Amino acid sequence: VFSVLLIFIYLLLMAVAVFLVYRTITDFREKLKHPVMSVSYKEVDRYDAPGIALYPGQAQLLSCKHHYEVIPPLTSPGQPGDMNCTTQRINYTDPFSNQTVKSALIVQGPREVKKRELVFLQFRLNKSSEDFSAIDYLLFSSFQEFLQSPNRVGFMQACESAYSSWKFSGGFRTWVKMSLVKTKEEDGREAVEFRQETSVVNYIDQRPAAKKSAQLFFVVFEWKDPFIQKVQDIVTANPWNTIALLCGAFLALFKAAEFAKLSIKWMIKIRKRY
Amino acid sequence: VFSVLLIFIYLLLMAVAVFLVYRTITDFREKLKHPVMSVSYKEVDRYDAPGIALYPGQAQLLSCKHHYEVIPPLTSPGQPGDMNCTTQRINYTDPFSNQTVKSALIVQGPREVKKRELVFLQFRLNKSSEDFSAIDYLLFSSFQEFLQSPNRVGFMQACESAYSSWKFSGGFRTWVKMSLVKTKEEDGREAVEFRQETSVVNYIDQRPAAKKSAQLFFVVFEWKDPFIQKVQDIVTANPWNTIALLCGAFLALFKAAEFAKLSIKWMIKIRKRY
Amino acid sequence: VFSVLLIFIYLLLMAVAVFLVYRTITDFREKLKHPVMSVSYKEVDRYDAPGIALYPGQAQLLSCKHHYEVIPPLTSPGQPGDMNCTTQRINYTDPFSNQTVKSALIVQGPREVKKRELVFLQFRLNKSSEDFSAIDYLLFSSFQEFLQSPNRVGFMQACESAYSSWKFSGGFRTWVKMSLVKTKEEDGREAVEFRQETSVVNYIDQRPAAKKSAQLFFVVFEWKDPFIQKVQDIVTANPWNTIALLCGAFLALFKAAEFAKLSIKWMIKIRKRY
Numbered sequence A, B, C: 001v002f003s004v005l006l007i008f009i010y011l012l013l014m015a016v017a018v019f020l021v022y023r024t025i026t027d028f029r030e031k032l033k034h035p036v037m038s039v040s041y042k043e044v045d046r047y048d049a050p051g052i053a054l055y056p057g058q059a060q061l062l063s064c065k066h067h068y069e070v071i072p073p074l075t076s077p078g079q080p081g082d083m084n085c086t087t088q089r090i091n092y093t094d095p096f097s098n099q100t101v102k103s104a105l106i107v108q109g110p111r112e113v114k115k116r117e118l119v120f121l122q123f124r125l126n127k128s129s130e131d132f133s134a135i136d137y138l139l140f141s142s143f144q145e146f147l148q149s150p151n152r153v154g155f156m157q158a159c160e161s162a163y164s165s166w167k168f169s170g171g172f173r174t175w176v177k178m179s180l181v182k183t184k185e186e187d188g189r190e191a192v193e194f195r196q197e198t199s200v201v202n203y204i205d206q207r208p209a210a211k212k213s214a215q216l217f218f219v220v221f222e223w224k225d226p227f228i229q230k231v232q233d234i235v236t237a238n239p240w241n242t243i244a245l246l247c248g249a250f251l252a253l254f255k256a257a258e259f260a261k262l263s264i265k266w267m268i269k270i271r272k273r274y
């Protein structure tokens, strides 16, 4: 049976090999899916001029100011003037219904983050029967790409279908801080997405001191921090390394079996002593 | 007196082996206490009816509409009517103080994200000496489960102790989104957590145009996107692979020692040439 | 030509070795640029008192109270009283411009999260021509460390440079919630950051019911959850040469090649049999 004992060592080795193979294959199956993610933060000297698409509707733009200081100056309510920005009016068909042309007002944003550059926009809307005043706006990465790239309808259609719009209220100013997150998929595209944290500041009617009762909106756009987020869905399943380790483990089993065979020859000598 | 020269590389090799073992055990110990995080997404054609747990207390319900258009239509002030919602009133002893009982009403939330159906409901509360108005509310995964599972009080106690209880103001509309994140514990249980980003839009007192001083609440629940987040806690450095790695390193080190000793025998022949 | 064919195993071996070296070099050179992020949550029985800094300017505090009960009490606004907080006024020059000296107040935060401790602060401000009333506040890890550490101006300069400041409006309260995120940087250092999610509730003017129309701001500070969130970036393998890995793989592969070539020598015996 001693022959069967050496084959018993061999069968233990084979069972270990079977367990190793099945464990490794199921581990590789699991690791192919459920990839882990990594986040890296980069710094930018000055953000690329972003694009803000407003949808005022029946409300006209009173004053747009590109203010460098982090403290905007005083304002004269309902006083047209002080327009030193860039604006383009567009008529594009929303993909949702292909029946309502959603007029858009496209405006350049702030670039110099380190000088706390910000954009101040004032809007006036004559009282109506809406019962709820709101404005919806959208953000996209670059404005010069929009201006230069032909078929602007196409670019903003892609923007609207891809990104999301979050409306700001009326009757009190809204402070908006933007942040950029870049994600890479299997196709190697650096998709850019925007995030914002809002902080509404109430507006005082004491300054007007009039009976007009006309709703006013104020928006402030600013860059939160120079840091840009970059999320990568990293993959830790390397077929070549796993195959190399599998072969190494197989040959380790075989060579440990050779060591055990040398020990079993020692034991054969032992038996010969007895 | 050269056997020590032959064993010099042997002792260096054993030092290498000790260093490798210490480093590997330290790495495994560090890895067993620092699990990694992963995130996954999916496209879902129809969400499961989420829970609604408004706690009016002393404010009655005037209207609750299950709209299917992203833009709710015009609404008159006050004038209760148009009840097209499913409601269930439940009383349960608090799970924190066991002193007070908070009467709650449960509503069925939007299901179709693709049609972007919203639920728009409004409450009014007569003048009171509170001087501050606000209504609590919390969400849970499903409403049909709660309707069917007996011993409701226990389910609500668990939901309240687990899910966060948010608060929405009174006096203007609070467009509230939703989003689901699902996590798997080491046991294997699936825990679903709600998170959302509210958006406040102001009311207008012109529509009432009366001296009533009555609160007019307004809430709009809506699904954000057809993406359900999953967070997974991946554990790296499984033990069998590490053991196989260490054994293979030992075998390779010993075979390198044997090859080096054969080459040292050749070099000793060379020395014999001198 | 049979000699070359006998070495053909060697040609394939050299190709495999080139591929393996290139793949491992590129992979482990690419694995340092983007490490892997890991997260965890720690439960804390009771937080360390944090320091809450405010910049009232022309505003004067009216009442600061700690409230262990979840529901804060109701009072008559406009009457100073019930001051049960600790404050240490400071006057320091900001780092951004080194020209504006900004007097700042500091108050003790809520410690016992389990007992539901919330800090209630009332501020009063006379009507002016500002047209936009807001107060910006900051959070630092522990007020006590500030009291103990000399050169306190330096501590707040560092705090202002590091942390971000977000303001709350004037006219309705704000129920600020706080949470702590700890991240370890590569240089053996731990950084603590504050996160929050505001929730504004409208304030009712019925209590004054007078023509003064003075501005009142109400702030509540609470702890979101006792959990502290730690995030750390960790690497994969840090050998800087990983010479042992590929060396052992190569030696194992070469010994396997030697055994297969002995088998091919048996095959040479075969060919001799023809």
Ligand SMILES: Cc1cc(-c2ccc(/N=N/c3ccc4c(S(=O)(=O)O)cc(S(=O)(=O)O)c(N)c4c3O)c(C)c2)ccc1/N=N\c1ccc2c(S(=O)(=O)O)cc(S(=O)(=O)O)c(N)c2c1O
Pocket (backbone or CB within 6 Å): A241, A242, A243, A244, A245, A246, A248, B020, B023, B027, B245, B248, B249, B250, B252, C236, C237, C238, C239, C240, C242, C244, C245, C246, C247, C248, C249
């Ligand atoms: C020594 C060392 C090892 C590792 C490490 C290596 C591998 C690994 N996991 N996986 C694999 C996978 C496959 C393997 C294969 S294959 O399947 O056939 O391909 C074969 C073989 S083998 O049979 O040849 O052994 C393997 N061992 C394989 C393997 O280990 C893991 C998880 C870890 C990592 C680090 C490491 N030594 N690190 C050092 C080592 C030294 C450092 C030194 S020192 O002055 O030299 O003391 C200084 C400094 S400092 O100046 O920055 O302070 C350091 N940072 C030092 C340092 O970081």
